[PDB]
Structure 1
Amino acid sequence: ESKGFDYLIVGAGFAGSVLAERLASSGQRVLIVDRRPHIGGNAYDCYDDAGVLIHPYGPHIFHTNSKDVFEYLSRFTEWRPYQHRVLASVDGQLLPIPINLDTVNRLYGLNLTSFQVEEFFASVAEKVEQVRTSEDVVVSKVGRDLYNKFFRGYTRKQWGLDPSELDASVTARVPTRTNRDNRYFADTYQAMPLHGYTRMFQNMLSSPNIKVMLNTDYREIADFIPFQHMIYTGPVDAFFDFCYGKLPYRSLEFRHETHDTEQLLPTGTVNYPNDYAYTRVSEFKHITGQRHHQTSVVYEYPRAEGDPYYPVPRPENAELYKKYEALADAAQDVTFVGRLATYRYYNMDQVVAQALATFRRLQG
């Protein structure tokens, strides 16, 4: 039709890359761009100095209930079945989280059945008018003491806020159980890409219709490169030059280490609600299924400043986003999709859905 590209996609993570593949399979000329020197966004993996497969930006475990998302992804990767399991260091023990029958019995030295632990949870639970805060969701189900041990400290360390300063959506992510299930997810499809996300993303972007541009801020090229439409997957407040001020995103620092032993942790991840500066340690071999004479772990330190990783879900922040959203829905030739761009605390599968949905919209 004209010079340049039909689409200019800003960001090569799940949001941007899914659309890039859909548009290009549809015959669109697509330029995908990322300020980072690699594709895959947060989900990027690679081999470290020791030859172990890791995630530079923390542990990404894939899980979904969407047969459609799982089948779409199945087009670009084979799978390694895996059901993630997390232990929480509490009172010098490693207990299951989410809280379940075993957590209670092990913590207090009880012997409740699955039927009795309901009466117990009910016997300590705090009555809450209406549930609004992350404090509310937890305390109204399992009571004050279990809240202090598992949720209050972790949350304050992770967010820099009390759970009461956070939307109930936040801690509602980790629901309590009364059975003896110890998986962090009870999703239908739990599995990791056989050869890593990066290999999966490379297939996703392999069309002749797709051009990949790296180490590039869209603003550096958007001036002299012709494109008929733009898909932005970065932060919003930044897209509109913070005109309304800074939309708060919580950040992280990662400290990777390699140990001359086959196994360091009992599970993929151990949470630290009450001790240490880090929130958790992850061991990639548990996740990937890789065999190696050594192992590599990563420690996560929450940070107020740095690359945005988490939207900060709270009443005041929801308001501030709306104003930016208004500008966004107003943007004539720009479509906003992704965790950062639409300010949603989304998992990988959720972003893939929202991207696939957005694709269908771009075709009436």
Structure 2
Amino acid sequence: MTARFDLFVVGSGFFGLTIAERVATQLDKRVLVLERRPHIGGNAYSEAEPQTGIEVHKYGAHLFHTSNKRVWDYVRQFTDFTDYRHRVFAMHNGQAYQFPMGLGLVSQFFGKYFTPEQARQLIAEQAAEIDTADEEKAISLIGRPLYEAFVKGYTAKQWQTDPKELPAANITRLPVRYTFDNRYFSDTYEGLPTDGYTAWLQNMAADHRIEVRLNTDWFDVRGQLRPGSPAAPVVYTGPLDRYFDYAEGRLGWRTLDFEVEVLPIGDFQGTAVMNYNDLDVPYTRIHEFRHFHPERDYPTDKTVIMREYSRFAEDDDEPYYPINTEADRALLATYRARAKSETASSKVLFGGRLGTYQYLDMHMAIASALNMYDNVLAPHLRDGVPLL
């Protein structure tokens, strides 16, 4: 029997699309990508806002960075990168602060300049208030003043829970920089895709051997599709608990809501991203998208901002970050065993952030897929090797 496709990929985020592109192009195979949303790219999807023309990241700000030379070389086949270098500011009590915690924030907050060494001693003294051994571990690492100003209100909004009520294991290191360096990321390579994320994502899928089906949920079509390509493996990047119909209970997740507003002014905040650390401000962050692409010709009489909000994901909400409690990890342990049998019996592989129950940045999602490809999928499809 002639097969219609050689591989199915469920999900068109960076993990799915990396899988699909390597298999199409390197093995010369036919791939079908099923995407349940109205567009490709998963949460890295971007779109120009109509009134301004400004490219908006639809599901929050997506900053690209890596120290992996392979990933860097790979991504630049599909896009050029800009020389953008990410910096973040924090708003606390009507004042904007250099961020993350370093000499700049420390001198601003405490009202005078501290030397690298005077700052080391200052933090060590305030942190001494609680021993890390026995509000949190946070205080025990950075002191009560820095905690109550920059970590308490912001954690309470992210988790939608009082920090006294979250596990101490949640934080392992809460470092202060003892230098004035406020470059957010510390990786070798960084920038924004010059023509945006959506152009990059399409170029990943542009090969003629890759078909993408939008508005198509895998659980609606899998029974109509596999019979016609019965030997094709399935690379599944949707929710792991959902794959098994939630039989063992639901994995806990946190969502985000976004309010995009267009303002009749050129510049709302003078930077790309402002953290709002205070509990009395309902959003965690404001993004101002013009500052992501200074090099573009954007109108100077208008701007687009996005307010980002965290909440408790109800059943139905889009999953973004794992809550990862002790009961979630037993449940993940359970579903991992179920997945391992589904690989042996049905050729379904589990990958990506949802398939795996892990937060993954883009570069880690791409490297993960390159690994799945090199070690699991390429040996199976090209040679004979079992998928297990």
TM class by shorter-chain length? Answer: over 0.9
Q: Give the corresponding residue for 1:284.
A: 289
Q: Give the corresponding residue for 1:180.
A: 180
Q: TM-score with structure 2 length normalisation?
A: 0.88
SS at match of 1:316: helix
* AA of the residue aligned to 1:211: E
* AA of the residue aligned to 1:347: D
Contact kept, 8 Å, 1:87 with 1:95, in 2: the verdict is yes
SS at match of 2:378: coil
How many residues are aligned here?
360
* AA of the residue aligned to 1:104: V
* AA of the residue aligned to 1:48: E
| Shift, 1:129, TM fit | 1.7
Q: 1: distance between equivalents of 2:170 and 2:365?
A: 17
Q: Give the corresponding residue for 2:97.
A: 95
Q: 2: distance between equivalents of 1:206 and 1:283?
A: 30
| Shift, 1:326, TM fit | 1.4
SS at match of 1:202: helix
Q: 2: distance between equivalents of 1:291 and 1:167?
A: 47
Q: Give the corresponding residue for 1:148.
A: 148
Q: Give the corresponding residue for 1:354.
A: 368
Higher mean alpha-carbon deviation, 287-296 vs 242-251, is at: 287-296
Q: Give the corresponding residue for 1:30.
A: 31
Q: 1:306-342 deviations in whole A, cap 9, x for unaligned?
A: 1111111332322221111111122121111111111
Higher mean alpha-carbon deviation, 153-162 vs 165-174, is at: 165-174
Q: Give the corresponding residue for 2:15.
A: 15
Q: 2: distance between equivalents of 1:17 and 1:302?
A: 28
Contact kept, 8 Å, 1:98 with 1:175, in 2: the verdict is no
* AA of the residue aligned to 1:341: G
Q: Give the corresponding residue for 2:221.
A: 221
Larger radius of gyration: 2
Contact kept, 8 Å, 1:166 with 1:313, in 2: the verdict is no
SS at match of 1:78: coil
| Shift, 1:169, TM fit | 7.5
Give the CA RMSD over aligned residues.
1.9
Q: 1:13-70 deviations in whole A, cap 9, x for unaligned?
A: 0110010001111212100011101111100111111211111111111111112111
Alignment of 1:78-93 (within 5 A): 78-93=80-95
Cα–Cα, structure 1 residues 194 and 174, in superposed 2: closer, same or farther, change >3 Å?
Answer: farther
Q: 2: distance between equivalents of 1:169 and 1:22?
A: 38
Alignment of 1:46-85 (within 5 A): 46-50=47-51, 51-85=53-87
* AA of the residue aligned to 1:334: V
Pair 1:239-2:270 in alignment: no
Q: 2: distance between equivalents of 1:168 and 1:40?
A: 35
* AA of the residue aligned to 1:248: G
Q: 1: distance between equivalents of 2:92 and 2:99?
A: 10
* AA of the residue aligned to 2:92: V
Q: 2: distance between equivalents of 1:166 and 1:233?
A: 29
Contact kept, 8 Å, 1:11 with 1:233, in 2: the verdict is yes
SS at match of 1:270: strand
| Shift, 1:168, TM fit | 6.4
Pair 1:322-2:328 in alignment: no
Pair 1:343-2:348 in alignment: no
SS at match of 1:225: helix
Q: 2: distance between equivalents of 1:169 and 1:360?
A: 34
Q: 2: distance between equivalents of 1:187 and 1:166?
A: 30
Unaligned runs of 5+ in 1: none
Q: Give the corresponding residue for 2:383.
A: none
| Shift, 1:213, TM fit | 0.3
Unaligned runs of 5+ in 2: 380-388
| Shift, 1:167, TM fit | 6.1
| Shift, 1:176, TM fit | 2.7
Q: 2: distance between equivalents of 1:260 and 1:173?
A: 42
* AA of the residue aligned to 1:29: R
| Shift, 1:106, TM fit | 0.4
Q: Give the corresponding residue for 1:301.
A: 309
Matched-pair identity in %: 39
Cα–Cα, structure 1 residues 69 and 343, in superposed 2: closer, same or farther, change >3 Å?
Answer: same
Contact kept, 8 Å, 1:167 with 1:315, in 2: the verdict is no
